[PDB]
Amino acid sequence: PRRWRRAAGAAVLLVEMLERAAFFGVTANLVLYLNSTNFNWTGEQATRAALVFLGASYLLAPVGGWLADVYLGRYRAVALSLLLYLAASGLLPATAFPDGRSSFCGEMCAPVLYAGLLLLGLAASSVRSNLTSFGADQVMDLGRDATRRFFNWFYWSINLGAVLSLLVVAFIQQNISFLLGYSIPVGCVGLAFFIFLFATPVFITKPPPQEDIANFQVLVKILPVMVTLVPYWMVYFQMQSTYVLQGLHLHIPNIFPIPEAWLLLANVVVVLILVPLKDRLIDPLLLRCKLLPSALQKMALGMFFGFTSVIVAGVLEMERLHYIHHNAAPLSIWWQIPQYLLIGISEIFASIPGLEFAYSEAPRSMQGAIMGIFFCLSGVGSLLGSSLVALLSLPGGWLHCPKDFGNINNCRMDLYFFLLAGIQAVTALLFVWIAGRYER
Amino acid sequence: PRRWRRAAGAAVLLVEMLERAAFFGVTANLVLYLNSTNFNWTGEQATRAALVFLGASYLLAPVGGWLADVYLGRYRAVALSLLLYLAASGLLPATAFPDGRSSFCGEMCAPVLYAGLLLLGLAASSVRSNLTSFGADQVMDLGRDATRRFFNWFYWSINLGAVLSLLVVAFIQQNISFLLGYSIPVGCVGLAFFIFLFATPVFITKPPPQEDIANFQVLVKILPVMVTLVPYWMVYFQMQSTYVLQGLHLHIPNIFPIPEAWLLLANVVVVLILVPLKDRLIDPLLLRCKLLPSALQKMALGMFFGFTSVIVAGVLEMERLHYIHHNAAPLSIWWQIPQYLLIGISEIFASIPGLEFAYSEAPRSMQGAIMGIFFCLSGVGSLLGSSLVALLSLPGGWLHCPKDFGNINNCRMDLYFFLLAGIQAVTALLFVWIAGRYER
DSSP states (O other): OOSOHHHHHHHHHHHHHHHHHHHHHHHHHHHHHHHHSOOTTGGGOSSSHHHHHHHHHHHHHHHHHHHHHHHSOSHHHHHHHHHHHHHHHHHHHHHHSHHHHHHHTTOOOHHHHHHHHHHHHHHHHHHHHHHHHHHHHHHHHHOHHHHHHHHHHHHHHHHHHHHHHHHHHHHHHHHTOSHHHHHHHHHHHHHHHHHHHHTTTTSOOOOOOHHHHHHHHHHHHHHHHHHTHHHHHHHHHHHHHHHHHHHHTSOOOOOOOOHHHHHHHHHHHHHHHHHHHIIIIIHHHHHHTTOOOOSSHHHHHHHHHHHHHHHHHHHHHHHHHHHHHHOOOOOSGGGGHHHHHHHHHHHHTTSHHHHHHHTTSOGGGSHHHHHHHHHHHHHHHHHHHHHHHHHIIIIISSSOTTGGGGSSSOOOHHHHHHHHHHHHHHHHHHHHHHHHHHOO | OOSOHHHHHHHHHHHHHHHHHHHHHHHHHHHHHHHHSOOTTGGGOSSSHHHHHHHHHHHHHHHHHHHHHHHSOSHHHHHHHHHHHHHHHHHHHHHHSHHHHHHHTTOOOHHHHHHHHHHHHHHHHHHHHHHHHHHHHHHHHHOHHHHHHHHHHHHHHHHHHHHHHHHHHHHHHHHTOSHHHHHHHHHHHHHHHHHHHHTTTTSOOOOOOHHHHHHHHHHHHHHHHHHTHHHHHHHHHHHHHHHHHHHHTSOOOOOOOOHHHHHHHHHHHHHHHHHHHIIIIIHHHHHHTTOOOOSSHHHHHHHHHHHHHHHHHHHHHHHHHHHHHHOOOOOSGGGGHHHHHHHHHHHHTTSHHHHHHHTTSOGGGSHHHHHHHHHHHHHHHHHHHHHHHHHIIIIISSSOTTGGGGSSSOOOHHHHHHHHHHHHHHHHHHHHHHHHHHOO
């Protein structure tokens, strides 16, 4: 933050959102290609594959980020991850041209796509973690209140980038043609890399035994704070889809003139408005009234609202079944935006304070590695959370409610939200118990 | 514990159980008399008055115990409380003889009964707290493991005394006559006082500024641990009646050949068997496996089982409504004994560790006062808990389920158990948060 800290932060947000946009675009491209040509298993997939692939990218994040920050530095890390992304986008014309496929699966299509997906996940995770670390370092050199403000703005920028990604890739790759849908990601990546190269003067670079063993004692005390985050991430990830499932069972209203995937963006637009309100209102009042949320009570209050979000979800659940007992209806569909706003309060109070929390036990030897493993907690809660959904879907019944739009089945939506509240309360009870041993 | 610590402990248990028996007997006697003669309001009461009167006794416990331990000592405290009990039992012939009533409410029946009830509550609370303090002092002079064993045995003896009280007072005062029902409490009190006077040699007596101000700093740090116990006591006391209400809505089975009040004893007999199993099995394994439950994690684990007891209660709740949706039945009435055993595990892990917890921040100037205010937390959770039940009964509906045996009403039993789980989880979250500041 020499003189253009505003321009540096803005460029960071732009390059991050464009990276996320290109990521979603190329993932949808490769998934569609795999489903189309032969790919003998065909993936057996049309949608929801993107979420599990982002979870797999989060799973691959820790080792890639660790390698990047231990054997490549911090600037060359993003540089080479973006270069591997250029390699993936230069493999993309093989997806475009039929000669590419004829040369891929004309000899020893499947393995080259496996390698491309692996490299793409590694590069995306590395560039995400390293841009987060860049912004964090810049704002820690700037100020602590500025650090919190920039973390909130960075999460808001991630959300806006995901929204614009969804909309623009859907529009381009479904409306006009395919070659434009192939040149949009490569062009956005090129212009984001140009912006990043134009921002290298205002960016501050940093250089890459018994001191390494001392880091293990720091790991054995912060990991219990992070291994207990997996149950919290396991609970929230199905709520990102069950809230869509709960909203799908309601009568949608017609006011002011893909629907099943728009509710996925509905959880994101809630974060798009909660952060600007929390940044300008909650931040000043939290300093004057002296609530003392020293980056840990904020995370505990978020999951408290997260458990309360399940309370409003469970209360709304029984309110839907009691109307059926009266003898289908919207079932207070407008009463779902508060719990959608409440889960956004839980998300803004667990991600942004959690991101700032990870930089408290940072010590600057593996600062990028602790960020990759932090995103891994979400991916583990995503894959195992989706596996818990998939396990309760085919032979389970507890997640088989989507069939027959939840009319006659062993749905047990009341038992799931009630058991999820118990798991969330246990996760909240275990966290405060571990947080009590954290300060010790 | 000079040589007859076994006999001393046994005499303590006997005098405590006989005191509780006489207490229940005389309370039922006075309630029946008030309801019978005129007592213009008539109490508007037939049953459930005993619970609220025990809650009022708990409310009066703190000031009485404080006066007893600050201006009377410890032995003279029990002595004069039992003497006031003799005064109440000598007022009881006025309840018996009609001339007593003609002289009471022939001039300035109501005020003498108010004074008698006040003195009876004060004496009962004082003798209970002082017998608890006597046993605690004896076993702390004996040993710590012996202290925990005797606390468990003392709670078990309280439960057995309540059971024998119920059964014997019901049998005598309903089967044969009334004069025997009047001589049973006075005779039991006399023989218990004789046993106590026979045990004074083995009992060890104890004698009754800036040091008093220093006790306030101890109060401002242990009260938040105890004010947060009121929500836990507020949650459990309706569960002592809602479990009876939930069991009343089921089809009772016929096996091996007052029913609505027997389930109140069903929660007590569960404690009558859980303590002997916990004393001989849980105590040895807790020492060898090194779980380190240093009198606070035990209390936190109890409410964790208490919240889990609501989980099994809530899961059983939706299991009862789902059968009605299938289209009344026992609704797995035998699946209620685990949650009855689970709430007994929560009770044995919150009372006995809580009693031992109160003696950790004891310091021996007001050791009897901290026990009276501890029982006051249950009474406050009892009266306000019953008030919450009464508030949700007439205009509420959430507790109006007993009417029409929960067939057609605004029962909302699913919303109550779900909201009670949230309040219990908040109480559990607030406790661990306060317990974290306790060791600090």
